[PDB]
Structures are given as C-alpha cells and as structure tokens.
Design an enzyme around this catalytic site. Structure first.
Site, PDB file in Angstrom:
ATOM      1  N   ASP A  21       5.304  -1.746   4.269  1.00  0.00           N
ATOM      2  CA  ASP A  21       5.887  -3.114   3.544  1.00  0.00           C
ATOM      3  C   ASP A  21       7.268  -2.403   3.279  1.00  0.00           C
ATOM      4  O   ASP A  21       7.375  -2.140   2.063  1.00  0.00           O
ATOM      5  CB  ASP A  21       5.175  -3.765   2.790  1.00  0.00           C
ATOM      6  CG  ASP A  21       3.811  -4.537   3.593  1.00  0.00           C
ATOM      7  OD1 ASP A  21       3.909  -4.898   4.743  1.00  0.00           O
ATOM      8  OD2 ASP A  21       2.779  -4.726   2.769  1.00  0.00           O
TER       9      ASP A  21
ATOM     10  N   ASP B 200       7.341  -3.317   8.320  1.00  0.00           N
ATOM     11  CA  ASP B 200       7.476  -4.664   8.149  1.00  0.00           C
ATOM     12  C   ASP B 200       8.565  -5.318   7.437  1.00  0.00           C
ATOM     13  O   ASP B 200       8.522  -4.941   5.920  1.00  0.00           O
ATOM     14  CB  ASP B 200       6.208  -5.280   7.528  1.00  0.00           C
ATOM     15  CG  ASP B 200       4.930  -5.486   8.647  1.00  0.00           C
ATOM     16  OD1 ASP B 200       3.958  -4.492   8.309  1.00  0.00           O
ATOM     17  OD2 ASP B 200       5.127  -5.594   9.748  1.00  0.00           O
TER      18      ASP B 200
ATOM     19  N   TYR C 200     -12.661  -7.527   2.909  1.00  0.00           N
ATOM     20  CA  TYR C 200     -11.210  -7.172   2.676  1.00  0.00           C
ATOM     21  C   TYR C 200     -10.336  -8.133   3.795  1.00  0.00           C
ATOM     22  O   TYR C 200     -10.068  -7.575   4.857  1.00  0.00           O
ATOM     23  CB  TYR C 200     -11.055  -5.683   2.863  1.00  0.00           C
ATOM     24  CG  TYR C 200      -9.472  -5.392   2.513  1.00  0.00           C
ATOM     25  CD1 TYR C 200      -8.296  -5.569   3.365  1.00  0.00           C
ATOM     26  CD2 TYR C 200      -9.081  -4.492   1.566  1.00  0.00           C
ATOM     27  CE1 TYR C 200      -7.183  -5.064   3.200  1.00  0.00           C
ATOM     28  CE2 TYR C 200      -8.056  -4.350   1.319  1.00  0.00           C
ATOM     29  CZ  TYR C 200      -6.837  -4.418   2.025  1.00  0.00           C
ATOM     30  OH  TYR C 200      -5.547  -4.047   1.890  1.00  0.00           O
TER      31      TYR C 200
ATOM     32  N   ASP D 113       1.248   0.418   8.111  1.00  0.00           N
ATOM     33  CA  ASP D 113       2.375  -0.214   8.137  1.00  0.00           C
ATOM     34  C   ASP D 113       3.054   0.241   6.900  1.00  0.00           C
ATOM     35  O   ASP D 113       2.399   0.102   5.688  1.00  0.00           O
ATOM     36  CB  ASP D 113       2.540  -1.692   8.418  1.00  0.00           C
ATOM     37  CG  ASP D 113       1.659  -1.908   9.876  1.00  0.00           C
ATOM     38  OD1 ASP D 113       1.437  -1.012  10.799  1.00  0.00           O
ATOM     39  OD2 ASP D 113       1.485  -3.125  10.077  1.00  0.00           O
TER      40      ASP D 113
ATOM     41  N   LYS E  16     -10.966   0.383  -1.965  1.00  0.00           N
ATOM     42  CA  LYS E  16     -10.347  -0.487  -1.045  1.00  0.00           C
ATOM     43  C   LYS E  16     -11.198  -0.055   0.395  1.00  0.00           C
ATOM     44  O   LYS E  16     -11.399  -0.762   1.271  1.00  0.00           O
ATOM     45  CB  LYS E  16      -8.929   0.166  -0.744  1.00  0.00           C
ATOM     46  CG  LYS E  16      -8.275  -0.517   0.730  1.00  0.00           C
ATOM     47  CD  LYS E  16      -6.713  -0.239   0.645  1.00  0.00           C
ATOM     48  CE  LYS E  16      -6.040  -0.811  -0.446  1.00  0.00           C
ATOM     49  NZ  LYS E  16      -4.505  -0.595  -0.355  1.00  0.00           N
TER      50      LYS E  16
ATOM     51  N   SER F 102       0.962  -1.260  -0.143  1.00  0.00           N
ATOM     52  CA  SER F 102      -0.042  -0.010  -0.119  1.00  0.00           C
ATOM     53  C   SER F 102       0.871   1.210   0.069  1.00  0.00           C
ATOM     54  O   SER F 102       0.757   2.286  -0.648  1.00  0.00           O
ATOM     55  CB  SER F 102      -1.105   0.044   1.292  1.00  0.00           C
ATOM     56  OG  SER F 102      -0.232   0.112   2.417  1.00  0.00           O
TER      57      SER F 102
END
Length: 513
Positions: free
Chosen positions: A97, A149, A219, A95, A210, A84
C-alpha cells in the site's frame, strides 16, 4: 504507562515464556510466512524507483506550469507506505500500500493524466490499471513483479521535502476531500507503531494473530469480520497492557481479554482528539450510527473512525466464539500440552453447517462480473442482518471469499437460464475472473461468469421462509447505479451440506463423510 489504562503485568518474560516465544517464531517459519531476503531487497528497490519517479513527476508538472529550474527542483514530492508493509507484517507476494504526496500545484488530474503515462512507459511496470472512481482513487500495477496499490494526496504547501512527516493535524487544512481520505491510512499506521511499547514484540504477535484470523476465515472487512487495520489495533491494545512481555505472552493472553471485553466499550490506543477540520469524529453520544457499532475498534489518527462498522450480531458471535476456542488452545500451548501449530488449524466452515445459502452474481462478460460480484459481495452484510430477524434463523455466518465459475453454454437461452439461477446440469469450470480479465488485457459458445458466496445458517432450537430477505436483497443489489439489466443477474438458493459443490473443498481436502 502505555495506553489509557493500567497494565495487567509489567514483569519480565520468564525462561519458559522466552522458550515458547522461540517456538512461536519457529511455527511462523514453519508456515512459511517470512519472505526471502531477495524479495525484501526487491521491495526496497521498487520503492526507491517510485520515489525517483515521484520527483520526476512533480518536477515535470512544475516546469509545465513555468516554474524556474531552481524552484522546480525544490517542489519535491514523497512516497509513503502504510498497511501491512509499513507495519512490517506481510507475507511473500503481498501488495505494498503506497501513497504519493505532492505540493499544492500538483493536482489529482495530474496524477491520472501525467503520472499514469510515466508509469506505463517504464519497462518494469506491468498490469497497470487506473481506477479514479474508487472511494480512494488508486492506480494499481506491478513494478518488477511487486504489486503496488498507489494512492495520491495533494497538500496545501508549496514544497514536499524528503523528510516530511504526516503527523501534524494542520497538514489536513486546505486539502481536498479525497486527499484527506488518502492521507488517513499512513497517518493511522504510523500512530499504531508509535503507541505500542515494543515494536518487535508487536510485529511477531500481529503476524500470529493475523495468520490465525485468516486460517479461521474471520479476516474480511467487507462481510463484517475485522480487517488488517482492525486486527492490528486489537493486538496493539494488548501490547499496551503487557509492556514488558514477549510475543508468545501477547498472543496467549490476547484471546481471553478480547472475548471478555465489555463490548461495546471501544478499543482505543489513545484518547480521541479534536482537530482543525469541520468533520465528524467517532462519537456514540452524538451519532446513532456510532452507538450501533458492536465491537468498535477506533483509529488513533485524527479524525478517529470505527474500523469495524460492518460487524453484525452474527459475525460478532462468530468472532467471540473463535476467540473463546483460541484462548483454550493457547492455555494448553503455554503449559506445553499442545504445539503452536494447534492454534493455526484451519476452519471447518463447509463441514459444520447443515444448511447454507448460496448467493451468486452472474454476468455475460468477465469485466462486468468483476464489478458486479464486488457490489453483490458488499451487500451481504445487509442480508446477514435481515436473516437474523427471521424467527427460525439464529445466526447467519458469511464465509470470507467467493468462488468463480465459468459456464460455456450452448445457446443464448441456456446462458440466460444459468445467469438467472436455473443452473441445472450445465457444466462449468472453476476459474478466476480477475486473472482472466487481466490476461485479456496483456494479450457457438455463450459464456456465463459467476461468483458465489456462502452463508452458513444456525437455526433456532426447535422448510425455511426467506422470501422477504431474498426479495429485499435482489432489490438492494439492483439499485446499484452501475446495475446493467442486459448483463448482470443475482440469485439466492438453499443448499444442503451434501449439495455443496466440490469447489468449496480445497485440493486434497476430503469432503464430509
């Protein structure tokens, strides 16, 4: 042309479509989906710090292996983002990624043994938790409060320069299995952005789609709904069919195109390619498991895979019905009969069914409960499939998140009876086990920690027998290689709508009357 087939329309946006596009963005602002510039700048700063720690990390390893100063300064190392954040469609507090790529003389062992301590010594780093056993090995932590992450990939090259791009398929040659998997997310995100005609239009449309999907509770990949990557590719496909449109038009046309799509024909953003490896590519004509995929959304980066493996007949039906409903709302929005907010009305999952199944995972420690609840949740889609085959059940609709409770039992016998499903009148508190365990790290009652998932049951037209589905599910969960029969238990119960606990209705939400 964009994508594999001709566009539906190439016309410029009309004045009315531009106005509805402004109204769409205003409703996304109304929903507070855009983070402040300060938080955006903090994310850029955190990523810049991680890039410096990456170079420091690679240099340290190179010197420990007796490379000279000049070569150690050329070894490089690079941070990438995906998901995202990279797509530019992420909400406040989300978060990042993140992937660290290193040259061949830096190993996954160095990642957990050398980089991890370097992070722990930073004062900006908190909540550091290494998970080397995950499917994609990962180090989780917060940097200045930003959640990261962090995954790892070692390339088969002697140097990773700051300008390295990961698109070339040959970069996968000589890379270890877990590193090839760790590279896929970034390779997929980059291709999606390259395959849409207008990135700005795509981002706004994806943000709306989304948010709609989350508001409707469709989702969650783990239980068989599309996840972030799958929704992104679906939006990208529609963007290709309307290369000159604005986001309002993408959103308005999205729903009908996808619920009238000739499933199981796949969603492809480009033709499936071959590559230099000896690995499976998604192919229903060779692999029966690929033929069984119901709504296949295929990733564009070699090697292509289906991002919606988990979809069941039940979740397919729910997804399609949700799209039909949203398409009729969007039709009214685009003639100004309804505001955009009408599209984002929340689900009524806990109001709409007469009969639910409660699936509860229970454990004696919060730390054991986190892993065990995750395991049990990951098996729900198999229960959903077996429930469909019960003649009396037409559809088994899984909700997309579990509910945590803690029971402060008075004796070991009472705790045993709560954990096994003889929860009678024993009092409990709604809680969050993940936050509890993390708080404990940052630091006679017999507590039982439970997490409950819900399945709504749509019964056939004209007491229910789920003995075998229940037995099969218990046995499947208890086959987990980490199942600990002194710590963990699982149980299923029938629950009438009127017996739903208060936990499933959010603060200030009225119960069904």
């Amino acid at each position: 042309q964009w994508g594999i087939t001709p566009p539906i329309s190439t016309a410029p946006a009309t004045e009315q479509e531009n106005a509805l596009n402004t109204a769409l963005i205003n409703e996304l602002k109304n929903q507070n989906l855009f983070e402040s510039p300060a938080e955006s700048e903090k994310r850029v700063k955190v990523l810049d710090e991680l890039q410096q720690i990456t170079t420091e990390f690679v240099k340290k390893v190179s010197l420990a292996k007796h490379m000279n100063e000049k070569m150690a300064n050329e070894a490089g190392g690079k941070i990438f983002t995906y998901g995202s954040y990279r797509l530019g469609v992420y909400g406040p507090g989300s978060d990042i990624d993140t992937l660290v790529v290193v040259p061949k003389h830096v190993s996954r062992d160095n990642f957990f043994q050398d980089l991890e301590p370097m992070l722990r010594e930073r004062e900006e780093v908190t909540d550091l938790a290494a998970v080397p056993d995950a499917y994609v090995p990962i180090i989780k932590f917060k940097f200045l409060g930003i959640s990261i992450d962090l995954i790892f990939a070692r390339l088969s090259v002697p140097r990773v320069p700051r300008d390295l791009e990961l698109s070339d398929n040959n970069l996968l040659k000589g890379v270890e299995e877990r590193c090839v998997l760790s590279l896929n997310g970034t390779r997929v995100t980059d291709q999606i952005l390259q395959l849409v005609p207008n990135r700005a239009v795509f981002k706004h449309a994806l943000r709306a789609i989304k948010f709609w999907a989350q508001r409707r509770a469709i989702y969650a990949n783990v239980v068989g709904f599309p996840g972030g990557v799958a929704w992104a590719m679906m939006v990208a496909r529609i963007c290709q069919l309307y290369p000159n449109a604005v986001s309002s038009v993408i959103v308005a046309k999205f729903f009908r195109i996808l619920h009238q799509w000739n499933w199981p024909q796949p969603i492809l953003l480009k033709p499936i390619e071959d590559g230099p490896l000896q690995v499976r590519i998604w192919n229903p004509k060779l692999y029966p498991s690929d033929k069984a995929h119901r709504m296949p959304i295929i990733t564009p980066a070699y090697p292509s895979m289906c991002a919606t493996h988990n979809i069941t007949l039940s979740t397919q039906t729910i997804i399609l019905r949700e799209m039909v409903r949203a398409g009729e709302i969007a039709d009214q929005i685009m003639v100004k009969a309804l505001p955009w907010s009408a599209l984002f009305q929340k689900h009524d999952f806990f109001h709409r069914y007469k009969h639910y199944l409660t699936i509860t995972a229970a454990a004696k420690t919060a730390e054991a409960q986190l892993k065990w609840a995750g395991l049990v949740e990951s098996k729900l889609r198999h229960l959903v499939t077996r429930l469909e085959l019960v003649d009396a059940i037409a559809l088994a609709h899984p909700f997309n998140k579990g509910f945590d409770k803690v029971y402060n039992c008075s004796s070991e016998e009472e705790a045993q009876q709560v954990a096994s499903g003889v929860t009678l009148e024993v009092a409990y508190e709604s809680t969050d086990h993940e936050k509890l365990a993390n708080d404990t790290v940052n630091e006679q009652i017999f507590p039982v920690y439970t997490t409950t998932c819900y399945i709504g049951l749509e019964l056939e037209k004209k007491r229910l027998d789920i003995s075998w589905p229940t037995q099969e599910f218990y046995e499947l969960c208890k086959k987990w290689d980490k199942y600990d029969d002194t710590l963990m238990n699982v149980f299923i119960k029938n629950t009438k709508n009127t017996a739903l606990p208060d936990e499933v209705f959010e603060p200030g939400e009225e119960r069904p009357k």
